[PDB]
Design a protein around this ligand. Structure first.
Ligand SMILES: *Cc1c(COP(=O)(O)O)cnc(C)c1O
Ligand SMILES: *Cc1c(COP(=O)(O)O)cnc(C)c1O
Lengths: 352, 352
């Protein structure tokens, strides 16, 4: 089964093999050494600024997402929404009593900075939340521009970097980001189960809220910065993530973005040639190709047919439910050989 | 590095190799079926009763612990404290505003069911929480008897089964347990990263509290029971946990309990021969041998010396921090050969 979902992603042999290394206690000096290395690799990708907390939470990307909200002292929080995942940020913010104010944008369209600027003049916010790449719509939001607006407004800047960190240019310092996160199984192409996160010194100063034990970033810091015991970590996944992070830096984000954009263009033309139409109206996310099926072809039925042909892709989600196919172009998903197989399988499905 | 820490534990090759199987999407019908197989085997060990929620949370055992508390509609909660991990329960219960009431007992001594009964006659409790095997002190608490008292008082019974599930006779049904949990790396000898849980029908009815997104057992239910989307799961760990569960049931808990007991006895004799003294004053935990070193021998230094000798064991934690050696007899730790190597290493350590 060829894995072309927009997360999880195919895992490099070198990475999956690291899972075979001898198991060790989570406080074993070697594991601690591995952990400091992970922080170094993550710091290079995140570019969090001095005094930041860098770690890999023991859970999925969603855990990373929730940690940056549940640890916040107070709201309100301006949540910029234009997809299923930014909608999840809003749901979490509401749950933790952070008094979120949702600013909606049409699914398939990027968040407009000018609209955000107007909203930031309406009320004072403790934090502004945005999803860099909305996986549910295949839209890339203008994170840098919004970060600048957030800094001017004196608000912390929360940014979901799942579809961008490890594949497209990214810098917390440059974009004025205070909290960034991702999952191990996205652009990093590592086994799922970990959530790399980064909190700027300013975020840490504000992260005094106590609403959860497992996601308490102060407890996480004790382990990642001082080698103390928080809870047992998924050691084998740590080995794998470090291996995956090295693969990323070895290739370079610049080259990885080119590999994604290159495949994105080719596949889109092949699909348009078969009657497919892109979903994003503007600012398409290069790491996730979202397309509407040819006339008369049901999206979900096509997803099932593809599976029968040996290929796994995602159907719509949230605002795009049952209306599209979402193809992964992050990590090992962005490969010529992989999509040539996809197209062959796709044609077999369309033939029926 | 021989792993004799009371969690994590040695992973048999058959189990670790399962991590090399083809990666698949978390919603792949094949993975969904592996999850069903996991629930079936967990149910065999837990014996949760019909209508129960059985799952493996994407996180360490502590996540399983918090899930059983954060979802509770209301308190008060009678928390029976006997060591580090029951203290963690108290911590989390206070964090989520469950109006916890702590009933203490000396570390090294088991919880007194007579004192529990008296406490229950004093006030109505929504839930009674206990740790089956207190890993920090190496003491086994009378869970079955405590469960009967909870059922009498009409309180839900929360039980940490980390050091017992998968190694010692266990049944929620027979022990009147409403919420039981463990971690994948304990007695099951699987890679850390998952937290098997089981919530009885009555627990689910009371689990309407909404304090966390990631640990929302309702959201977890949609995925484990109905195959819907909650968040990406650590699919590879799922493969490994299933293999681990199969291995556990092939051997049977009776044979595993026997293995642990035999080695516990002989090891303690060997240790006393060297001047060590057992920490527990009564009701020892067959799966965790906790001992104080000979006078004049620093426990933490001894742990570091053992490590240098190629053997990993745990030092104290919570009340026993720096006062003991905690030897694992959970899963693959309960092996004659493993401890014969432990002693040879211990002697090299003691000669320094
Ligand atoms: C190990 C342990 C836990 C917690 O597990 P982590 O996997 O480290 O989160 C909880 N309770 C007991 C009794 C344990 O031994
Ligand atoms: C995948 C993803 C997440 C995290 O989801 P998990 O499935 O919990 O790992 C968050 N945001 C976006 C935009 C994502 O694509």
């Amino acid at each position: 089964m060829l894995l072309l979902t927009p997360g999880p992603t195919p895992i490099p042999e070198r990475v999956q093999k690291a899972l075979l290394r001898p198991m060790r206690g989570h406080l074993d000096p070697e594991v601690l050494r591995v952990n400091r290395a992970i922080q170094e690799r993550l710091a290079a990708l995140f570019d969090p600024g001095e005094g930041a907390l860098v770690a890999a939470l023991a859970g999925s990307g969603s855990l990373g997402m929730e940690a940056g909200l549940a640890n916040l002292d107070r709201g309100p929080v301006l949540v910029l929404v234009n997809g299923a995942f930014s909608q999840r940020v809003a749901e979490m913010a509401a749950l933790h009593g952070l008094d979120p104010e949702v600013l909606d944008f049409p699914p398939g369209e990027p968040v407009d900075p000018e609209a955000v600027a107007r909203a930031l003049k309406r009320r004072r916010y403790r934090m502004v939340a945005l999803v860099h790449g909305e996986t549910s719509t295949g839209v890339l939001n203008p994170a840098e521009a919004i970060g600048a607006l957030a800094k001017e407004a004196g608000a912390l800047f929360f940014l979901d970097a799942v579809t961008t960190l490890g594949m497209l240019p990214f810098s917390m310092r440059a974009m004025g980001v205070d909290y960034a996160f991702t999952g191990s199984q996205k652009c990093l192409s590592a086994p799922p189960g970990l959530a790399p996160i980064a909190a700027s010194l300013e975020a840490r100063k504000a992260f005094t809220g106590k609403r959860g034990w497992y996601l308490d970033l102060a407890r996480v810091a004790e382990h990642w910065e001082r080698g103390g015991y928080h809870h047992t970590t998924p050691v084998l996944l740590h080995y794998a993530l470090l291996e995956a992070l090295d693969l990323v830096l070895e290739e370079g984000v610049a080259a990885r973005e080119r590999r994604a954009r290159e495949v994105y263009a080719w596949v889109l033309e092949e699909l348009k040639a078969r009657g497919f139409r892109p979903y994003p109206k503007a600012s398409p996310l290069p790491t996730v190709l979202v397309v509407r099926p040819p006339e008369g072809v049901d999206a979900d039925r096509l997803v099932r047919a593809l599976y029968a042909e040996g290929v796994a892709v995602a159907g719509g989600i949230g605002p795009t439910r049952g209306q599209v196919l979402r193809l992964g172009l992050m990590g090992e998903g962005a490969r010529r050989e992989a999509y040539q197989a996809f197209l062959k399988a796709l044609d077999r499905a369309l033939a029926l």
